[PDB]
Structure formats: structure tokens, C-alpha cells
Design an enzyme around this catalytic site. Structure first.
Site, short mmCIF file in Angstrom:
data_model
loop_
_atom_site.label_atom_id
_atom_site.label_comp_id
_atom_site.label_asym_id
_atom_site.label_seq_id
_atom_site.Cartn_x
_atom_site.Cartn_y
_atom_site.Cartn_z
N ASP A 221 0.78 -1.24 0.00
CA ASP A 221 0.00 0.00 0.00
C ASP A 221 0.81 1.29 0.00
O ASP A 221 0.23 2.37 -0.07
CB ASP A 221 -0.98 0.02 1.19
CG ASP A 221 -0.27 -0.01 2.57
OD1 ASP A 221 0.97 0.17 2.64
OD2 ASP A 221 -0.96 -0.21 3.59
N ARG B 115 0.67 6.83 0.07
CA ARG B 115 -0.26 5.80 0.55
C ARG B 115 -1.38 5.71 -0.48
O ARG B 115 -1.92 6.73 -0.92
CB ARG B 115 -0.81 6.21 1.92
CG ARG B 115 -1.98 5.34 2.40
CD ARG B 115 -1.56 3.89 2.64
NE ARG B 115 -2.57 3.12 3.38
CZ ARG B 115 -3.57 2.44 2.80
NH1 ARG B 115 -3.72 2.44 1.47
NH2 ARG B 115 -4.48 1.73 3.48
N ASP C 112 -7.32 -1.15 1.04
CA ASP C 112 -6.61 -1.67 2.19
C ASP C 112 -6.00 -3.00 1.82
O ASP C 112 -6.71 -3.97 1.53
CB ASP C 112 -7.54 -1.80 3.37
CG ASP C 112 -8.08 -0.45 3.80
OD1 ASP C 112 -7.28 0.55 3.89
OD2 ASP C 112 -9.33 -0.32 4.07
N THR C 113 -4.69 -2.97 1.88
CA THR C 113 -3.83 -4.08 1.49
C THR C 113 -3.27 -4.85 2.68
O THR C 113 -2.90 -4.25 3.71
CB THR C 113 -2.64 -3.50 0.72
OG1 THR C 113 -1.65 -3.04 1.64
CG2 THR C 113 -3.02 -2.32 -0.17
N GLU D 19 -0.50 -6.34 4.85
CA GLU D 19 0.85 -5.73 4.90
C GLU D 19 1.95 -6.64 5.44
O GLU D 19 1.71 -7.50 6.30
CB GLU D 19 0.85 -4.51 5.81
CG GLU D 19 -0.18 -3.46 5.41
CD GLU D 19 -0.52 -2.51 6.56
OE1 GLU D 19 0.43 -1.95 7.24
OE2 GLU D 19 -1.75 -2.26 6.84
N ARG E 54 2.77 10.91 4.87
CA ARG E 54 2.53 10.29 3.57
C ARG E 54 1.47 11.03 2.79
O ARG E 54 0.43 11.44 3.33
CB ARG E 54 1.99 8.88 3.78
CG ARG E 54 3.02 7.92 4.37
CD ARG E 54 2.49 6.50 4.51
NE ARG E 54 1.31 6.41 5.38
CZ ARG E 54 0.65 5.27 5.61
NH1 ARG E 54 1.03 4.12 5.05
NH2 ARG E 54 -0.42 5.18 6.42
#
Lengths: 129, 129, 129, 129
Positions: free
Chosen positions: D15, D29, D34-35, D37, D81
């Protein structure tokens, strides 16, 4: 002015609403406020009318608890609509409309009448003696 | 708030007068004032009740021209009484009573509502654009 | 999306509000909603802007309890305003604005993204396996 | 939602990609996804986390032209970010990940908000007059 629970049947327009009051359906008219028209048989829809209706409509629809300040005399207008102060979760509908410039306070002689009352109180007349 | 003639028939209390309106007998309740009563449902005769009754009676019986003015909203109650500002030779009985301390101005949210209407006007919102 | 209490310092415009969040003042921007301008330094006030501001303004002012759905990443816009979903007594401010035609849902690629997700779910790919 | 070039520097997670934006190193970001991680604060390496990381890395390192597209609202988080839709030769990394079941679409109130916006449009309210 004693609050009493009511439930929403359906919102009608800027100033009228249909509520279940005492186990019976009843169309209420918002006291002291006149909103532009939308469903009026004599002059149709007026500017800000749609916006007024949407305001009242969503105000009473998103409300968990609805209450009304409807007098023991159950006063109605010429079309049989009971006049009252309606609260959407404690927030008064008539005031919220007025504050957003979507309703105008209706013309009455109250301001003039209290002027006199103050004077009768000063002079401590009969009741105020 | 348009005036209309009416012929006296009989005064009933400090807050109620029976009039002949448009050819039909009609009993009117005075708008925006609360008078001590000789005919109170639970109390019977209240203090200053006879006084307000005598006042309305005298004021109404000695007038040459009686007129009723209606609220554009509330017009009738559950007892069938019309609601109006009654005039006796140009003088409002409602105000006459209040001035003598023989009646109080009814509780209302008008003052609050005008406060907000003033704010709306000032901010130039919708109808006040 | 976990609600957290905040208190009103002051309403700023249609889509921004200053709240006390975690013992510190913070200007919040309403997520996904763009209201017409009133206090914008580049193009001034736009049509329906005043009305938008009044809506948000009174919504958070008449509210007893205010809460915010502000992410753990505390995302802000280019002016440092934290983005969130604000609730005035449980009623979402961003939605109330949108529903009255006072705000437009902001353009994002979400609809397109979920289209793909559904397809990856169908094919039961990696995460959805 | 305007696109801008950016030069790869290094992929950090599924992400997160570090880019050279406008002459300055910037970490981005991915918006609205939503990845799993490899660098989760509490979990460390998640299942499918290596997969999404390998995917972003390969997708980003083999692109000739990278571009970032920003949300007109949220633009940065508390960690510094930037937030963006990143493109690798015209293909959005955000969507690429979602399509492979290597990322989920973030929770949002957009669907709800569009429902109401549609109602507002239909009723021809304010901005939709």
C-alpha cells in the site's frame, strides 16, 4: 405547552405533517410559521417551497423521537389541521425552519398585547395588584 | 388578519362571547389572552373572574359595531368555538382586558421565533435572499 | 469509522467546523462533501453558499452531543483540515447537507474500484480464496 | 482529480510507494484500498502481505511512466505520507491490486451519500434547482 409523544405517519409539506397522536392519525400544522407552498390548490408551488418541504420532511423522518406541544383545546385551522409545536428529537421544527429562512413567523397581535400587559403590571392593576 | 362584522348575542365569560356571524350563531374565544374565569371547568369562579366577565360584557354590550379578526392559522377549538380578536367600536376587547390587568398574554414561542427570523433575515437566507 | 466525542468551538462554513478533539482545537472538513463557498480566498461566495453555512452552523450549534468519525491516520487536506464524518446528535452532517441539495458528493474512484473487487471475489482470488 | 508525473524511488509495501514528486522525495499511501501488509505495526507480516508487496513492487518498478492523482479533499496523513491514486503506464496500481484480490476497497459512506444526493437531484433542491 406540555410535550406529548407522537409518531410520524408521513410528512406532507413545509408546514404540515401527519402523525399518530393518541392512537389516531392527525395532520398537524406548524404553529406561527408559514412556509412557501407546494401542494396548495389555489396558487401552486412558490419559490423555496420544495426546499422548505425537504427540510421538514427529513427533519421528522430522521428523528428517533417526535413530540408535539398541542393545546388541551386542540385548536385547528380552517382545514381541520391541528396547530402545534413539533419537536424532532427535542429540536423544534418551527424554529429550525424559521432560522434557515424557509419560513416566516406569522403576524399576530402578541407584541402589542404584551406591551399593554407590562403597563398593567406597572400600575399593578387587578390581577397584578 | 381581516376584520368582519358580527352582532352581539350574549357575553358568556371574560374570555368568551357569543356572536351572530354571517347569519349563524357562533361562540368566540378570545385569541392570545387568558382571563380568570367565572366558568372554570375545575375551579368554577376564580378571583377577578367576575371582574373580567363584567368587563367583557359591558365592553361588548355597549358597542355599536362589533368585529372579529381571525388568525390566519388557528381558527377553531374542539368545543366548536371560533378564535378571534374581537373589536368593540374599534377597540380590541382582547387588549382592553390585558390593559386592565384582567387578562394575561398567552404563552407562545413567538418571541423566540422572531429572534431566529431576525438572524435569518440578517444572514440573507433563502426567503430573505 | 469509530465514533469519538468532540465539542463545538465554532462553525466556519458549509463544510468546515472547529471542534475540540482530544483536548486540542481542530478544524475539521466534511468528508466526501463539497458545499458552495463563502469564505474562500480565490473565488468568494457561491450561490447556496450562505444557505449551506447556515445549515451546518445550526446543525452543530443546536446539538447536545457532537461526534466524529476521524481515521487513525488523521488525514488532512492541503490546508491542514482533518477530514471526518461529523454527527450532530447521531445525525450525520455530511449526509444532511447532501440530502437538502446543499452539498455535492465529491468525485472518487470508489464505484469503479468496488466493481473490480466484486470480480476478484467472484473469481475467488487470493484474499477471497 | 488531476494527474501528475512522479519518478519511482522505492516500493515500500503493498500500500505504500516512495516517489520523487516535484523534485522532492515523497512517500505515498494508496487511496481507497486496504492491502494486507508485510509492515503491519502490530501484526508484522500478514497473509497475502508478501503477495501484495511483490505485486506493487513489480507493477511499479516495471513502469515507464508513473503518475499520481489526488483526492481533492484528503491529501496527507499524520505520518507525512501523501495520499494518491498511482498509475503505472496508465494502469492504476490501486485498481490492479483490488482486481487480483490483493486489496479491499476501504469503508466509506459514499454509497449512502450518493443515495441521498440522487434524492436531492430528483426533488430539484437548491443546487439542483
Amino acid at each position: 405547552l406540555h410535550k406529548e409523544p407522537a409518531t410520524l405517519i408521513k410528512a406532507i409539506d413545509g408546514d404540515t405533517v401527519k402523525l399518530m397522536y393518541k392512537g389516531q392519525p392527525m395532520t398537524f400544522r406548524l404553529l406561527l410559521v408559514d412556509t412557501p407552498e407546494t401542494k396548495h390548490p389555489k396558487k401552486g408551488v412558490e419559490k423555496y417551497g420544495p426546499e422548505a418541504s425537504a427540510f421538514t420532511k427529513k427533519m421528522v423522518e430522521n428523528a428517533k423521537k417526535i413530540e408535539v406541544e398541542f393545546d388541551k383545546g386542540q385548536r385547528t385551522d380552517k382545514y381541520g389541521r391541528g396547530l402545534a409545536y413539533i419537536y424532532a428529537d427535542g429540536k423544534m421544527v418551527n424554529e429550525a425552519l424559521v432560522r434557515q429562512g424557509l419560513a416566516k413567523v406569522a403576524y399576530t397581535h402578541e407584541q402589542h398585547l404584551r406591551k399593554s400587559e407590562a403597563q398593567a403590571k406597572k400600575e399593578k392593576l387587578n390581577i397584578w395588584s
